[PDB]
């Protein structure tokens, strides 16, 4: 693609500059270029990729919800057409990210920290497709399948305080609550995840403790809304 002529190291440096500049579309394009070099990503580089696309799809999701609300209130073709324009652009970002995960980030990810991170991302981008889907059942099952594989590996290979494992459980619990219409599964997963993390905190340094408790606070925030 357009980044084929730039050094991998230059694409990563420019991703970090684009982040500082709040240029998330540029950041995502630089990280897509880095992934297409074909080398595995480091932990820092995986996080750059995730932050870039999360910011991009986050803008699109926020816009889609504003337009969907207006469209529902309105029930001229303009509101539907513009909601459909934003929806298609969102689907294209999800398809781009799922494309990178399947070509070939997941298949070359052997360590638990890489493989769980990428399978969580695959679950998250299917979830974003599911949010706008009205094939919806098959998209939901794709999200569930990715999250379940990531959960199985995380429970065998990572301590319960591992921030990737915690973020996975957080996002899978929100999948259950509002995509799968399984609020009881969401609450059960959030509580078990919180309680098992609480009991492992004793093992951590000050810096790991801060990283784990930050995500545990998001589980608590959801449980407070759900109960």
């Amino acid at each position: 693609g357009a980044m084929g002529s730039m050094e991998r190291a230059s694409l990563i440096q420019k991703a970090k500059l684009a982040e500082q500049a709040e240029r998330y579309e540029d950041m995502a394009a630089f990280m897509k270029g880095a992934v297409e070099k074909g080398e595995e990503l480091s932990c820092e580089e995986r996080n750059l990729l995730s932050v870039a696309y999360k910011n991009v799809v986050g803008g699109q999701r926020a816009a889609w919800r504003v337009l969907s609300s207006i469209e529902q209130k309105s029930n001229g073709p303009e509101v539907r057409e513009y909601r459909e324009k934003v929806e298609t652009e969102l689907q294209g970002v999800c398809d781009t990210v799922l494309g990178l995960l399947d070509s070939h980030l997941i298949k070359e990810a052997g360590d638990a920290e890489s493989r769980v991170f990428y399978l969580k991302m695959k679950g998250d981008y299917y979830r974003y497709l599911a949010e706008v889907a009205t094939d919806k059942k098959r998209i939901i099952d794709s999200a569930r399948s990715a999250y379940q594989e990531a959960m199985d590996i995380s429970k065998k290979e990572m301590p319960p305080t591992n921030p990737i494992r915690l973020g996975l459980a957080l996002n899978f619990s929100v999948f259950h609550y509002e995509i799968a219409n399984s609020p009881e599964e969401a609450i059960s997963l959030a509580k078990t995840t919180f309680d098992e993390a609480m009991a492992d905190l004793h093992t951590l340094s000050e810096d790991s403790y801060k990283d784990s408790t930050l995500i545990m606070q998001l589980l608590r925030d959801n449980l407070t809304l759900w109960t």
Binding site: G59, S69, D221
Partner: peptide, 12 residues
């Protein structure tokens, strides 16, 4: 919509 608490940038 009430959005729940997912991991990473609260970008939406």
């Amino acid at each position: 919509k009430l959005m729940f608490k997912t991991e990473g940038p609260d970008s939406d």
